[PDB]
Design a protein around this ligand. Structure first.
Ligand SMILES: O=c1ccn([C@@H]2O[C@@H]3COP(=O)(O)O[C@H]3[C@H]2O)c(=O)[nH]1
Lengths: 158, 158
């Protein structure tokens, strides 16, 4: 789908794409500035765009496809069109990637570096706000009960 | 407690407890302005500062004491001094309280209205960034609980 979004002719639909992103929420100003600063990447199915406990700090705006969020071997969510990933490392200068993010399928993403993002968010506070809202949602979702497994051990030494 | 932080005499100790807040991160200008627009309240052991599915939207900076965070009858966290509460209902303005907040002992909290907080934060990007950062930290701790395998061992030796 890249070719639709590439170049000056692609900009009309690149800006609208980024307007639909949950972190942008329709703001043309942020979308236009974001459009100037992102780089388009395709992601192969099964690719780990982000790996847990690595020290990348890029943010990805998901235009197309979907990705597994995996912590310590277990999937805890999936993220699809108009979602974002990598914001947690981008707003915390000393935190490693909290999760592996793996393409369930072929995806198209807009990548922005921490340096370009922090410079934009500096004077577009509402990006920090909209990130907070997303993190609030992830926090408020399906707490359920963490199971304790009970084991009885009969130990024999040789 | 409240005596220490009230009036001109108290302002030095009030600003100091405020600039120590997880949301203020040592910034003096923000602490000084916060102080100008908070009301100190004593919260008593047992008193529900905030009730789940209620529609208050004040933010509280915890200066002294600690409080239970409760979702549908059962606790999920404790917030101590330098924490805050009610920050989500000043980030999602159309949303009821997500949790009850019951004081575990006598507390001194600083209450600011949504109106005053929003006005302050609007020209002070860092408050929204600070909120995002603490929500990211809390989601990290949750990723860890949810994906940690919890095991209860009973060992018999022969
Ligand atoms: O409950 C959730 C839902 C989504 N995520 C994402 O995993 C990403 C991993 O890298 P990061 O730490 O820079 O950013 C993270 C988030 O975007 C998560 O960690 N937990």
């Amino acid at each position: 789908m890249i070719e639709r979004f590439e170049g000056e002719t692609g900009m009309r639909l690149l800006v609208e794409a980024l307007q639909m992103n949950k972190m942008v929420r329709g703001n043309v100003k942020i979308a236009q500035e974001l459009a100037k600063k992102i780089v388009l990447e395709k992601v192969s199915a099964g690719d780990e765009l982000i790996q847990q406990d690595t020290e990348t700090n890029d943010i990805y705006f998901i235009i197309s496809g979907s990705l597994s969020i995996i912590v310590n071997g277990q999937q805890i969510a999936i993220r699809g069109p108009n979602d974002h990933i990598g914001e947690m490392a981008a707003i915390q200068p000393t935190q490693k990637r909290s999760a592996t993010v793996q393409a369930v399928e072929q995806c198209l993403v807009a990548k922005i570096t921490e340096a370009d993002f922090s410079h934009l968010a500096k004077n577009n506070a509402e990006l920090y706000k909209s990130i907070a809202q997303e993190l609030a949602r992830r926090l408020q979702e399906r707490n359920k009960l963490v199971t304790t497994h009970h084991l009885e051990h009969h130990h024999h030494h040789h």
